[PDB]
Design a protein around this ligand. Sequence first.
Ligand SMILES: [Ca+2]
Ligand SMILES: [Ca+2]
Ligand SMILES: [Ca+2]
Ligand SMILES: [Ca+2]
Ligand SMILES: [Ca+2]
Lengths: 262, 273
Amino acid sequence: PETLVKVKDAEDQLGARVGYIELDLNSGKILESFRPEERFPMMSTFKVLLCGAVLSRVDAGQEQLGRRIHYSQNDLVEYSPVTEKHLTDGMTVRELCSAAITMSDNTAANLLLTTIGGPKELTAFLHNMGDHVTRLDRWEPELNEAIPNDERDTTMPVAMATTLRKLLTGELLTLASRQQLIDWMEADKVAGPLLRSALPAGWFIADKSGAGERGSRGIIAALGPDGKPSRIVVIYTTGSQATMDERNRQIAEIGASLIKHW
Amino acid sequence: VAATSVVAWGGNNDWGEATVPAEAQSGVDAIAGGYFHGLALKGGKVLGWGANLNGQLTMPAATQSGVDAIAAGNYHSLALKDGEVIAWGGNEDGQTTVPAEARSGVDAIAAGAWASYALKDGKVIAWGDDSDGQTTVPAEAQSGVTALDGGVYTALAVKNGGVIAWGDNYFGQTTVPAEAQSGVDDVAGGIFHSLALKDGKVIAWGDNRYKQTTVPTEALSGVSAIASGEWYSLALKNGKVIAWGSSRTAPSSVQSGVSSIEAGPNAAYALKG
Ligand SMILES: [Ca+2]
Ligand SMILES: [Ca+2]
Ligand SMILES: [Ca+2]
Ligand SMILES: [Ca+2]
Ligand SMILES: [Ca+2]
């Protein structure tokens, strides 16, 4: 319970709400939690659920990972480092997922959302998977607005963690798809100052960070020592006036606590 | 002018590009914002921070001293040292292969997302990606140019106070307004919008869906400098920073005492003198 202490201290330090849930990957048992059932904006962490839905379609044969999508200047929105470079040659579904998950490319996420019918459809995907809490209502970049008490584009730590576990280990996705999803998360490029910074050598981590307005910051992860994941950890925070670095630091320290008492 | 402190803000600082390390917090006279990294010039030496996946922070030995200017793009970095342009980082599109004419006599540089530009004896020299025509220099920009800047899919230049613009024009970001055909002192290129500074007045054109060209009243006179990110802009007036576009604003820390500004794709930087 020293991680719980650190989480509560993170709220003290940031002057904001922090939601936390640590699950045992195997049994799917809750090992520790804080504000597990309160809602928080997902921000880019929803992109892992989005690609989960895409892979489900690939598995059912309604989509191809190699299918190439061409888009136009009209599709671009901010924070789209990869997609802005492929206006001419386009990008495949696989490349779009890699960009959305590993670089938080907003346009990539919007393009993929279109392949499934929009945000309501992702929410439909979540419902039929057994997650009646998690909801996506808007597209990028609006969905990161995080206006207080607004439930649009939110999830609960326990809901997101459960859904993440179902996607990574359940029978929902084929073995090949489960492995591609976790591969994208392991290749995450924008989460170094978070859980990864508290990680000693030889540890395995596959994650997805998220950043939004009004202090919203978050991360979902599957990690474990000896190059093998063994626990799901979800952390969300919102409302803080602190710098991004100060918020990264608090999440990092929560990570250190998890590791030191693992 | 050597800054005594530096303030960076805007974006999610996902790559650490908006965290100016202690060593660059003072004594720096210039900063260049890249997509995943930042560069600073201190006593002629190039400093850097952020992500280095493409080697944009693996400083060539020659940049350790005597550098006069710097610029940054998506995957590369540029330095101007005694008329010579030095480049490093990602080169998938030839943006770091400096042509012979840009190895001496150059008095200014600018980086585009995947391109590089040098100004020498009034002539703009460009290299790197050209899939949007951003590196095919118009005949007009090959003589008499006094200022230049690179955008994501575009580039701009000032010739006899008139703007010359090329590359993508999907949103009219390259259609120069009658008002910017003379008296212009500087230009800045956004992803889908463009800026010109004319005798203290900020003129903007191109996309406006995210308010990029909705110039605050205060920025219509007395502005000494401008800068553009991809979807937001900056203006400097009497030491006070003004920002607009994509809900960007200027924190109280840059409301006074700023001597120069820099706009990266997402992160803004203010050098307080
Ligand atoms: Ca508390
Ligand atoms: Ca020199
Ligand atoms: Ca070329
Ligand atoms: Ca000049
Ligand atoms: Ca520029």
